[PDB]
Amino acid sequence: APNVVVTRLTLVCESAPGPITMDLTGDLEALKKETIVLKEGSEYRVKIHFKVNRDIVSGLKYVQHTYRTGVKVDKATFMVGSYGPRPEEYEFLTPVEEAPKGMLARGTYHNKSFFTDDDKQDHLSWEWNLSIKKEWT
């Protein structure tokens, strides 16, 4: 196994009716067909779960590109930092944001995420899609 293994992404969202999560050790091609529903304007954080198996690592970074029709790609980079090896996964959470709101902001957002580091290692790259809706259903 590699030293760094990305295991899961969770959208932390107090107001959501149920868990919003994806197993990133699974089939990343199938993951593209999933659609996460977020009610417009909901507060959320992105939580990345990962394991460090063998050696202390430094300079971890989470990079998230969000595509939306008609708008320039939104590119966000987060410093994740240094972690030692242990059996239990670590969790990194982005700062809280407000999901888009209004009828013109509803519908599909396409995300491409990267877990990487100062050494530009591809710990994991993955796509996942979000649908912003008026209600949770």
Ligand SMILES: N[C@H](c1ccc(-c2ccccc2F)cc1)c1nccs1
């Ligand atoms: N600011 C918007 C934008 C940015 C991020 C998200 C988002 C990404 C992951 C989880 C939940 C989210 F709400 C949605 C909309 C964009 N502007 C230009 C392209 S995307």
